[PDB]
Design an enzyme around this catalytic site. Structure first.
Site, mmCIF file in Angstrom:
data_model
loop_
_atom_site.group_PDB
_atom_site.id
_atom_site.type_symbol
_atom_site.label_atom_id
_atom_site.label_comp_id
_atom_site.label_asym_id
_atom_site.label_seq_id
_atom_site.Cartn_x
_atom_site.Cartn_y
_atom_site.Cartn_z
ATOM 1 N N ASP A 82 0.873 -1.329 0.023
ATOM 2 C CA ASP A 82 0.019 0.048 0.068
ATOM 3 C C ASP A 82 0.858 1.164 -0.138
ATOM 4 O O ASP A 82 0.312 2.288 -0.829
ATOM 5 C CB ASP A 82 -0.974 -0.039 1.199
ATOM 6 C CG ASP A 82 -1.771 -1.315 1.001
ATOM 7 O OD1 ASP A 82 -2.204 -1.447 -0.173
ATOM 8 O OD2 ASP A 82 -2.672 -1.724 1.882
ATOM 9 N N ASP A 112 10.842 3.623 5.828
ATOM 10 C CA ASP A 112 10.837 3.705 7.377
ATOM 11 C C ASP A 112 10.219 2.282 7.975
ATOM 12 O O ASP A 112 10.187 2.112 9.057
ATOM 13 C CB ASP A 112 9.926 4.953 7.804
ATOM 14 C CG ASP A 112 8.471 4.788 7.584
ATOM 15 O OD1 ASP A 112 8.134 4.059 7.018
ATOM 16 O OD2 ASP A 112 7.777 5.688 8.296
ATOM 17 N N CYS A 138 4.939 6.097 11.165
ATOM 18 C CA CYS A 138 3.877 6.591 10.534
ATOM 19 C C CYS A 138 3.065 7.491 10.992
ATOM 20 O O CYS A 138 2.319 8.030 10.187
ATOM 21 C CB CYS A 138 3.068 5.265 9.905
ATOM 22 S SG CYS A 138 4.187 4.133 9.121
#
Ligand code: MG
Ligand code: MG
EC number: 3.5.3.12
Lengths: 363, 365
Positions: A207, A213, A353
């Site tokens: 996605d 990260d 995130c």
């Protein structure tokens, strides 16, 4: 144009003025009306707030709920958003040593791949998040037309930028720009001189298209943490081995070889039926299906001033070993484990995130 | 439920130094003609004028944020905030300060859209109820909540112990019907740090919908001195209100022992809503009617004091507009008086410059 006045992106372990976090809500991504994810976001915000100031941004409909759940010393402000991934929709802050000594970059955004490949159909609120944050804080804004997310870039604050090809060269981002043109923009905007391109990100991260990260980050100049497994039947293995090979053939912007510390992923996590059934099914976002491999890695931790905020996934052995490795790797920081990080990974991200650091402005 | 008096706080006068001014942003089609475009231009005008004196933050709804940001110069901060209407004098916090936890706090009064379900100006004030808490949260300033209904436009202070108010508003059964005058005074002493009260019976003629706020009738020019809305025309219903107020003021002694001096500030010639103006408003039955022929509640007293500036209305009566600037300039010789053109656009919706602003005092060191 930030090169013209000596701006650069500092390392995440340099001093912060505050951390910015969104607040989760949408019922087609967050199960049980986002209540379990809200408690985890509140827990992340509180943990960080022990180290440095936090501002949480919440939608009009959620403001009172957020304000009620969060400690008084955490600021809560109203902000419209399509989802709550401020690493990616928030601004990338840059500083200089001396008019102001901080600015924010407002990249273009397309919900991680746009009309055909993105995670949801409407990102009109997310497009304004960076402007709104910078306006709130009265920090100057540099706009860039290139599509970029903060989760796709990592820096060591010594001239190196660590990225994936899977993300930055994807056809759904900036296909008109060559690798060299992308590097040129990142040199000018982040104040970097050299790059380490990992080919791929974490298995299961279709996605975001393999954000750096969730794969590999700096621990200090010349040292990275790399998502790892020794299980050769896991599709992650080939990605980890390939990344290690590239890292072993890399030199940073100051002429150092890279030391790699392996951070072992949890045993494979798969979305359950109880979890998938708590999410509304329609066609505004990507379907969340039972049995999908969760893209979980301990590398998606956040560094705050003297603190490491790290996920715990409910894998007893790997959860405790991740804490041990992180405590050893950051001996001057306090490592804090966040239980129920699985609730964030169900929605396709983790602690790193959901945060965006605001550096201290140099004097 | 600790009072501001316990912590040393008092409401400073509007002429004391500000950190910034807060303003909302008009939008709703049943109160603002032509999709609020005329009013947005005048709000923007006010924000820009104040921004020459001190920082300004404009708050705009999620649907209006981009439009506001594009309209306003970048030295004005624009923040997203939900609201039912844009009258921050009344829905925003009343800031208070102390000498020496911060040395500034804000009071978050209860609100009911100027008289509630049966006598208020619109039917849903849910977002307005949260405006004060959101502003104070944004600034990280401590909050004192009060359960009494009160609007900032209903109170004026000299910063030296005196509070000026109207009976028409504060003693209305549509506000706090289970409180007496004495109980209201006692709360205002505790929360504003005042000791004495000047009660004018009535506010301005034409202010029925909000029940006669003091800020459209009479305000302090400086301690001991007030500006009073005035007419010499005895056929205007305003005249008896002005005369009654002058009588009260003439027999008033402030908290420090001064007899009050009154400066007359003449209202424009009577103004009335036009058919063109009214026809530009949507009739949806969530807000009160705006009808052609209505007397506009227009007074030059509804000005704002900024750091070194006076931001004053101009209503389109060229004689009285010029005279008001003259009077204000004489009254505030250390301030620059600025007239806002097309202030009539605000008055069509029941208020003026003072009603759309909320000062944030500088925090004492
Ligand atoms: Mg952006
Ligand atoms: Mg209130």
């Amino acid at each position: 144009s930030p090169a013209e006045h000596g701006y650069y992106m500092p390392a995440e372990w340099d001093s912060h003025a505050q951390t910015w976090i969104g607040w989760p809500e949408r019922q087609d991504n967050w199960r049980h009306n986002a209540l379990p994810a809200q408690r985890v976001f509140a827990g992340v915000a509180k943990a960080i707030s022990k180290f440095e100031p936090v501002t949480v941004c919440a939608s009009p409909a959620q403001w009172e709920n957020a304000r009620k759940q969060l400690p008084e010393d955490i600021r809560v402000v109203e902000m419209s958003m399509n989802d709550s991934w401020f690493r990616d929709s928030g601004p990338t802050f840059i500083v200089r040593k001396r008019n102001r000594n901080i600015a924010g970059i407002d990249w273009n955004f397309n919900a991680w791949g746009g009309a055909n490949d993105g995670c949801y159909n409407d990102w009109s609120h997310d497009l304004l998040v960076s402007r709104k944050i910078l306006a709130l804080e009265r920090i100057p804004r540099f706009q860039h037309s290139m599509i970029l997310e903060g989760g796709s870039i990592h820096v060591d604050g010594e001239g190196t930028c660590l990225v994936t090809e899977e993300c930055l060269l994807n056809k759904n981002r900036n296909p008109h720009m060559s690798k060299e043109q992308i590097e040129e923009e990142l040199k000018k905007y982040l104040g970097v001189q050299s790059f380490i391109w990992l080919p791929r990100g974490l298995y299961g991260d279709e996605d975001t298209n393999g954000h750096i990260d969730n794969m590999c980050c700096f621990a200090r100049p010349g040292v990275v943490l790399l998502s790892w497994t020794d299980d050769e039947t896991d599709p992650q293995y080939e990605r980890s081995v390939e990344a290690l090979s590239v890292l072993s053939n890399s030199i940073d912007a100051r002429g150092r070889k890279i030391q790699v510390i392996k951070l072992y992923i949890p045993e494979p996590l798969y979305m359950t039926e109880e979890e998938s059934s708590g999410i509304t099914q329609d066609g505004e976002a990507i379907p969340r299906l039972a049995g999908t491999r969760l893209a979980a890695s301990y590398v998606n931790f956040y560094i705050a001033n003297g603190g490491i905020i790290a996920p715990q996934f409910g894998d007893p052995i790997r959860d405790k070993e991740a804490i041990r490795v992180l405590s050893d790797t950051f001996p001057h920081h306090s490592v804090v484990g966040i239980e129920n990080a699985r609730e964030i990974v169900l929605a396709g991200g983790n602690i790193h995130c959901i945060t965006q650091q605001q550096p201290a402005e140099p004097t």
